[PDB]
Design a binder for this molecule. Structure first.
Ligand code: B12
Ligand SMILES: CC[C@H]1O[C@@H](n2cnc3c(N)ncnc32)[C@H](O)[C@@H]1O
Ligand SMILES: CC[C@H]1O[C@@H](n2cnc3c(N)ncnc32)[C@H](O)[C@@H]1O
Ligand SMILES: CC[C@H]1O[C@@H](n2cnc3c(N)ncnc32)[C@H](O)[C@@H]1O
Ligand SMILES: [N+]
Ligand SMILES: [N+]
Ligand SMILES: [N+]
Lengths: 453, 252, 453, 453
């Protein structure tokens, strides 16, 4: 295989695939912090060309972390459909990119092709894609899942109600819930990030969430985004189960950083089948984001885009209901400004859709990064046109606990009426009977949380 | 006339024709979240957006303000810093913020209590205001309870430009049984005084993972009271010493 | 009116309306170069709040240039419907922004309200609007015009075919024409920017454009973007006239820099009515862009957003077929990076749609600016969701003559197929007859310029 | 619970739940042969009334085989969603039947309720259901699965192409393939029952099926209905794998009669994920039928309807693409005449749809039974109105090898055109491209196998 090319008469030679995957990335502060970024725009373009000329077999046979050394690599390699792989193993990444972008390629064609891929090959395609390539490519790759609502249908747009409080106070959490429901937010999940991690806290938050669900017969699901072990524990002891959440990393050492074993995710799948109040077949929830492996010292010289794609290969194994990247949650040391956060959000969603998971995105930023709320509104609309399955929702996007800014409840209603998108069909039926929505638009009395009183 | 930073602007209800306006004031009194601001179609109202931008301007300022050299000396604290030299590098080099500088390790073995059971470490992190506002309210009651019916309490010291994983090096250097790090969390929009606590039992730079720490976050007046947090941190260190485990390795 | 506000206990004093309009702008390099930007983010929010409390009369009665000293100010002030003005003269800029964004506000409601506005009031609303506000507000404000094609219909998306050459070579210009038509580009106009400004060169390019138009009976119109004086003389001499173009500025001193009198625009309107091959009643074409007034020293202490808004109040008087800002055409001295160019693009289009003109946008950037091609793809999609009437089109977006990069021919087909938008209905009927488009999508033989041979 | 009822002043005592389930069955020869049928029509109604008054917990806690003594009972009991069970454990079988048939009960309502059921409870509801109850109840309980075709969508009707031969002759098998495709049959599966059970014979038939599939790019899947062990070995050796089949029984002793372990079904699921040419996530295929448990002496005093319902709770664990009962495949010793075969067909399909599996039915009969071809035509139409996922297809329904008569290729086209039902949407698109079907109807050249030459 070729690891070198000549650009403008100058020869650009690279050491291995891991360097080609990293230097083909668009410029971001995380690849510079890892020392794997390209030195100039010429070497970045040269790395893209070498990457585009490598075959699917070249990248599949060279995982950034060895098989025998990483359980995430094993899971990705073991889950490959070898018949689908042998069909495409000799395709160059340039040909695979044009295959995904082709209008002659149907959704059913990609359904079998993506099974012959690994996360390293998925990341390789995103690296040689433009921003419009990432949006149009992901739009023609919808992924539909079902819990108590159906998510991912083209023409629909869901949103997670995120009611976080500085003390996990059930009065503050309920207040944000009635505000989000009045805007049509909550068909993805009503997920609470807990300021604590004790079992009696989770059950108290879950009892508050489901008290509202059972009161108005809301077709949705609840979740408290604590560690998966204490989620399993609370549900095993009587707490109402809906979605089971766990943060994931693209490497085994990254999972050990979060205290997560793969057996814990198998147990979450078994606890949900025995306990959870889910009509559909999908009840798991994962969240990702570039820079997690680098933060845990568990990237092994790989770039944060390749490591993020390994999240999607790991999540695909458990067929979750929803996955969303938290694109700008950490800080500028991994994604500095508006340009890098938008690019990462488009890459992450495209790679998640190419991996076959219900990919959403937390269009967000932090106050120590070079960004503002206009970035969240820029990316939320770009990803919506890309068919993003869902975004987050908070009052004005101000998280009083996580100390960051995400999208507002106004933002989901804006995207839905701007692009003529509907909620989940089960959730839309409830908003109509509640007098909150008509023809996908908010009624006059909508946006008023005192309507529920 | 209205000051967007005033309490009158923070308690503003924007719902035009409400179903129950008295209920709306009941939700507004129930949370710090920017609820009940109304809408202009599907977009936020003008005043609610103006207060959002005013709060972002104040939040972006607190990112680069350091705790003064005179304040840390006014608390009688030994100031020390990581490999980071300024806050601009601190935002882009988390690795350098997780290692003590060469003069840092030598200063620790020279002026701190050796082989303690509970070592308290105070650091700025990403919020100076979380240090200067909450310190005198949480530190006296914390270091009392650790001593009243207590044990071998180490010497306090301030780490400038520090990250959380630097407490693994501190526990290794001082041989501390329990390391308590009070650190300012990243700044929010409406407030920037959020202090956190990260505690680990006998850390090792080579084997300690992040899940080995116990986290108590949102320590401020809007969240967990610093006085209330002092009693639960002392209780925590007691259980981490009895169980000889921290993080997810503890019972219940 | 109040020129003062107290923010966080700090009193912020502002000189006049001109300073409040300028400092309420989002941060851009042109305002810093103009010495009119806000000193801090605190003053910028202070200028926004003072601006929100001023009434429509406060800004209507305080144009950045005096009536008796500027013919553009006279044209803007004389065109105001005074009955519609008296209905809204007491409304604050805050109430006007909520009135535009309201779902209870119909297109016919804004149709009458906008007649009581001036260009300075149009800029005031945009300054206190977020990026999503500029997008959703411009979407609910469609402007429909008609030449040989109808443009601006919601659900449609047009594109200008821009075939430029380094020597005005007609064979090189014709090559780019077949390239654009094969992608569905050209329903807005087939407009050539000319290297030379002589009459015979203009006529030669026109004969080439209409030779292609007449051979395949294309429903569209041709244009050569030279000075309006030599366009009129060439058309008077027998050259086929379609759209008559002229670059405009928001001040009389700015128009003098271009060598344009307001009587020249009256003549182009009279020449088009006598000579031009246009079926509809709109035949004029203007291009704008922030920084032109400051480049000519003709902003008179005003910011580039208020000056750009004055282009629209001027253009509205002549009711042209198409107007578009060339958002990043000049350089980084006026718009530095991706964030400022995206913001200005949403600003210019919202202000143009609020002024009642068929507003498009040349999503573009220069090579000495802090931007790349992924920026153009971000802005074209955000503006397409905002109902942008049209964008430009060149092979891969590379202008071999103007030395800048706009959107590609692929970009219009991507937007249309991504957002389910159609071309101009007359032009779409022609693409279907040519076997280029079926059901709004490019056929298999589309994108091939050899199809016309 | 009550094991007794007074009917017309006469007290009817019943031993256990096993006797009540058996005697509540409609009269069939298998229950008489099993010695478990009701002595009179009076006792049969008495067993129905006692069954109607027993709760869900009464039958969930009383499986016909003990948990510790049967792996199928363990699989059925362990898969129960215990939260959904506690909601319905106190409901009587009478209230559960009215709950299923209710128009106020949605598909999502049953989606969660069915998870709290066991196979013995599924049979209990069917025993107190009339023929129209079994039809209307199964219609409102659609189960949709997807391989290379989507099956089970309301308004659609699939069909298995069944080309069998007396010597597994591929030329005779291929002849029946072109016959079925010319009628629109084959969107469920092209499955061959093999004369021989050797690996090379299985691979030869597979190469013949997929040679036709690959030549015309048919969206479907191939299968050879041999033992699951030799199917797995043939696929491991390189034979093209589509659906993996295995006959199942409702007891561990019954599975031992077929030589099947539950680990064999886990392996077929793991082999299909690694080798099979399936775009969707479902690739397994099971066939059932009343009398198989009694034939193996593995019913343990239970009736053939309760034992058949246990096939579905077992099959649901593996989430297969298609399941179908072979209603009259064995002989009159289990189902005697037209009335018993129609009743069992409605029973099996309703119980399968209630259990959440893609339930079809081989409407068939044997030549030593009291039936003819007019019976198959009666049952196929009743089941099509019930939303039956698919039926079989052979030339005129005559199986030259299995020595029985199923439905014809004409029968699927009749059902589709009579009830305005379409094939699988992927397969219908292929029939339209082949000129075989237009608007859901056979074209003039349809029904002609020489069209493929
Ligand atoms: C950013 C963040 C993360 C980041 C950390 C990466 C990074 N470089 O910052 C990521 C996305 C990985 C993350 C993951 C998790 N987080 Co977190 N995190 C935060 C957040 C918003 C900021 C913390 C902060 O400002 N620290 C100060 C800076 C200066 O220190 P730092 O060295 O730069 O950051 C370190 C710590 O923040 C630490 N960390 C981050 N989160 C958590 C959680 C726990 C339990 C622990 C022990 C440590 C830890 O990891 C970083 C590297 O050392 C807080 C919210 C808050 N307002 O405090 C929640 C928070 C601390 N996280 C929390 C949770 C629940 C988790 C998870 C356990 C979620 C899950 N179900 O798996 C995971 C696992 C953490 C682990 N064991 O490694 C909870 C803690 C609940 C509790 N009382 O125990 C908090 C309070 C809020 C929340 N719900 O997200 N988190
Ligand atoms: C906010 C929550 O989302 C999760 N999260 C945010 N960013 C990431 C990330 N980059 N990787 C994995 N999980 C993440 C994490 O659990 C955190 O508590
Ligand atoms: C140079 C060309 O670019 C166009 N242009 C770019 N920027 C501006 C601008 N700011 N005002 C008017 N015209 C502009 C205009 O058509 C002119 O002929
Ligand atoms: C003989 C064939 O008929 C099918 N069959 C008929 N009746 C039954 C039955 N009762 N159970 C399982 N499979 C059956 C099965 O596919 C087997 O391969
Ligand atoms: N990641
Ligand atoms: N301008
Ligand atoms: N059976």
């Amino acid at each position: 295989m070729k690891l070198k090319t000549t650009l403008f008469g100058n020869v650009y030679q690279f050491k291995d695939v891991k360097e080609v995957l990293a230097k083909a990335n668009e410029l971001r502060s995380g690849d510079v912090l890892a020392g794997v970024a390209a030195a100039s725009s010429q070497e970045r373009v040269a790395a893209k060309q070498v990457l585009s000329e490598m075959t699917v077999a070249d990248i599949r046979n060279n995982p950034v972390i060895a098989y025998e050394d990483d359980c995430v690599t094993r899971l990705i390699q073991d889950d490959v459909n070898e018949t689908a792989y042998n069909q495409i193993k000799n395709w160059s990444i340039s040909e695979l990119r044009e295959y995904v972008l082709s209008d002659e390629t149907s959704v059913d064609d990609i359904a079998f092709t993506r099974k012959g891929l690994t996360s390293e090959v998925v990341a390789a395609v995103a690296k040689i894609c433009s921003n419009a390539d990432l949006i149009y490519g992901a739009k023609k790759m919808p992924v539909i899942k079902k819990a108590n609502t159906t998510i991912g249908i083209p023409g629909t747009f869901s949103a997670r109600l995120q009611p976080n409080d500085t003390r996990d106070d059930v009065q503050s959490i309920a207040a944000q819930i009635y505000e989000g429901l009045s805007f049509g937010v909550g068909d993805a999940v009503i997920g609470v990030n807990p300021v604590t991690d004790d079992v009696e806290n989770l059950s108290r938050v879950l009892d508050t969430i489901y008290g509202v669900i059972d009161k108005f017969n809301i077709p949705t699901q609840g979740c408290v985004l604590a560690h998966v072990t204490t989620q399993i524990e609370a549900i095993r002891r009587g707490a109402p189960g809906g979605l089971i959440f766990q943060s994931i990393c693209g490497s085994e050492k990254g999972l050990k950083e979060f205290g997560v074993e793969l057996a814990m995710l198998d147990e979450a799948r078994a606890v949900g089948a025995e306990f959870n109040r889910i009509a559909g077949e999908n009840c798991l929830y994962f969240e990702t984001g570039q820079g997690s492996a680098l933060s845990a010292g568990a990237n092994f010289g790989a770039d944060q885009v390749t490591m993020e794609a390994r999240n999607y290969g790991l999540a695909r194994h458990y067929d979750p209901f929803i996955v969303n990247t938290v694109v700008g949650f950490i800080g500028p040391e991994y994604l500095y400004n508006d340009r890098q956060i938008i690019r990462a959000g488009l890459e992450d969603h495209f790679m998640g859709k190419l991996s076959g998971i219900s990919m959403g995105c937390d269009c967000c930023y932090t106050n120590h990064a070079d960004a503002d709320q206009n970035l969240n509104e820029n990316l939320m609309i770009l990803l919506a046109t890309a068919g993003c399955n869902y975004i987050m929702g908070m009052p004005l996007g101000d998280d009083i606990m996580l100390n960051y800014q995400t999208t507002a409840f106004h933002d989901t209603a804006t995207v839905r009426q701007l692009l003529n998108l509907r909620p989940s069909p089960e959730f839309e039926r409830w908003l109509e009977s509640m007098g909150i929505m008509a023809n996908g638009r908010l009624t006059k009395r909508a946006g008023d949380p005192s309507l529920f009183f | 006339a209205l000051d967007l930073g005033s309490a009158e602007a923070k308690a503003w209800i924007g719902v035009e024709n409400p179903h129950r306006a008295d209920v709306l004031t009941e939700l507004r009194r129930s949370t710090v979240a920017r609820v009940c601001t109304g809408r202009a179609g599907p977009r936020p109202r003008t005043q609610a957006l103006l207060r959002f931008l005013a709060d972002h301007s104040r939040s972006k300022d607190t990112v680069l303000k350091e705790v003064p050299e005179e304040w840390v000396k006014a608390q009688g604290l030994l100031e020390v810093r990581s490999e980071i030299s300024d806050k601009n590098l601190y935002l882009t080099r988390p690795d350098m913020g997780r290692r003590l500088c060469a003069e840092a390790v030598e200063a620790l073995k020279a002026q701190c209590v050796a082989n303690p059971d509970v070592q308290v470490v105070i650091s700025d992190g990403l919020s100076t205001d979380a240090i200067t506002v909450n310190y005198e309210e949480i530190l006296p009651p914390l270091m009392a309870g650790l001593k009243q019916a207590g044990l071998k309490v180490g010497t306090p010291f301030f780490v400038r430009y520090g990250r959380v994983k630097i407490e693994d090096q501190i526990g290794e250097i001082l041989g501390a049984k329990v390391v308590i790090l009070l650190v300012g969390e990243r700044p929010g929009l409406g407030q920037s005084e959020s202090l956190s606590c990260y505690a680990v039992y006998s850390p090792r730079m080579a084997t300690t993972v992040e899940a080995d720490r116990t986290c108590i976050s949102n320590i401020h007046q809007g969240g967990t009271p610093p006085v209330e947090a002092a009693a639960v941190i002392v209780d925590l260190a007691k259980r981490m010493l009895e169980q000889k485990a921290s993080g997810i390795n503890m019972t219940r």
